[PDB]
Amino acid sequence: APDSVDYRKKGYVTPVKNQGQCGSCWAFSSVGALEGQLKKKTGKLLNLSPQNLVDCVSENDGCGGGYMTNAFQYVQKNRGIDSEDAYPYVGQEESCMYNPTGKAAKCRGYREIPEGNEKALKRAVARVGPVSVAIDASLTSFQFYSKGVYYDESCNSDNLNHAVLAVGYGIQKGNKHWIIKNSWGENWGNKGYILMARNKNNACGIANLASFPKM
Numbered sequence: 001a002p003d004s005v006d007y008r009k010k011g012y013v014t015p016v017k018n019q020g021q022c023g024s025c026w027a028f029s030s031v032g033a034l035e036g037q038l039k040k041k042t043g044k045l046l047n048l049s050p051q052n053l054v055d056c057v058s059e060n061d062g063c064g065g066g067y068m069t070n071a072f073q074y075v076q077k078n079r080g081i082d083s084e085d086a087y088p089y090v091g092q093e094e095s096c097m098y099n100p101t102g103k104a105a106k107c108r109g110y111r112e113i114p115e116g117n118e119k120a121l122k123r124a125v126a127r128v129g130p131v132s133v134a135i136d137a138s139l140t141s142f143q144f145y146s147k148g149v150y151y152d153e154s155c156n157s158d159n160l161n162h163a164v165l166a167v168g169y170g171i172q173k174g175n176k177h178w179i180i181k182n183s184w185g186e187n188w189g190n191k192g193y194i195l196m197a198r199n200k201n202n203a204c205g206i207a208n209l210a211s212f213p214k215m
C-alpha cells in the first residue's frame, strides 16, 4: 500500500451525527478528536458529549459558533467531559449542567499545525489520529457532493466557516484526498463523509486552522 490511512476501519471514529439547526459544528469537531485519542489511549472508543461543550464553553458562542482550540482548553481547565448518554444532545443552547459522575474523558492541552502546512497536517494525522480542521463549505458543489474527490477552484482559503474532522488520507484514481467526516447526518455526501482534494495548494483552506488535543 502507499501512504494512506483510514481510521474508520481502525475504530477511532464514532458514527456520523447531525448538528441540526445549531451552529455547533465546532463542538462536534472537537469531540471527534477527543474520541480518536480516547480509543488510542484506552482501547475502547466511546461517544463524547458535544452538548456539554455547547453549554459550558463560555469562551464560545453556543450554537452561534466557536473555535476548537477553545473547546480543548475547557476540557482541560474543567478536568473532564461527559459522555453522550450522560449529557444528551438536544441541539439547542441551555444551562451548563456538567455531570462529573459521567465524566468520560479528559485532555491535558492541545497543539495547532503550522498555518497552511499540508505536510505538517499529514504527519499529525498519521502519528496522532484524527485532527480537528476548519474549511470553506459555502460552495454548492460542496453541499451537493455524493462521490469523488471534491475540488473547486473558487473555494476560499480565507473563508474558514465550517469545522469538520480529518479521518485519514490516501489516493483514489490518481487523486490524493483527505477523508473528511461532516456533522450533517449520514444522509449528506458519501454516508456523512466527503473526500476533499489533497495537495492542490491547500484547497478550501484545509490546513489554516488545524489542531488536536493531547491526552
Ligand SMILES: *[C@@](O)(CNC(=O)[C@H](CC(C)C)NC(=O)c1ccncc1)CNS(=O)(=O)c1ccc(Oc2ccccc2)cc1
Pocket: 018, 019, 020, 021, 022, 023, 024, 025, 026, 064, 065, 066, 067, 068, 133, 134, 135, 137, 138, 159, 160, 161, 162, 163, 183, 184, 185, 209
Ligand atoms: C458551524 O455550524 C459553526 N462553525 C464555526 O463556528 C466555524 C468553525 C471553527 C473553525 C471556529 N468558524 C469558523 O470557521 C471561522 C474560522 C476562522 N475565521 C472565521 C470563521 C457552521 N458551518 S456551515 O457549513 O456554514 C453550517 C453548518 C450547519 C448548519 O446546520 C445544518 C445541520 C444539519 C443539516 C442541515 C443544516 C448550517 C451551516
